Amino acid sequence: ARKVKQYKNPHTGEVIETKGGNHKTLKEWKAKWGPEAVESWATLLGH
DNA sequence: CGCATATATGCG
DNA sequence: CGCATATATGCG
Incomplete structure (x- = not known):
């Protein structure tokens, strides 16, 4: 699925x-x- | 890594 | 919205 990645x-x-x-x-x-760096800071969100 | 598909903003 | 540019997820 088109899973959301949160980035911080x-x-x-x-x-x-x-x-x-x-x-x-x-x-x-x-x-x-x-x-x-940007990917390493990510978080997986089911949305 | 390359392909396919959905997503995502800018130029026009 | 058509297209270019870019990029995650998923197949292989």
């Missing part, structure tokens, strides 16, 4: 929720630190 940022205290794709805040965090 140790450096800003911001949070997101996405099922994937080109998403604004999620793309900034990949720019700022990296996709490995």
Whole structure:
């Protein structure tokens, strides 16, 4: 299923929720630190 | 990693 | 909304 991943940022205290794709805040965090980091901070949500 | 499908924002 | 760009989940 198109499971939601919540992501949270140790450096800003911001949070997101996405099922994937080109998403604004999620793309900034990949720019700022990296996709490995960004995925490692994730959480799985059944939604 | 490459393909398929649903998701997700921006250019037009 | 059509398309480009990107990207999770799932098949293989």
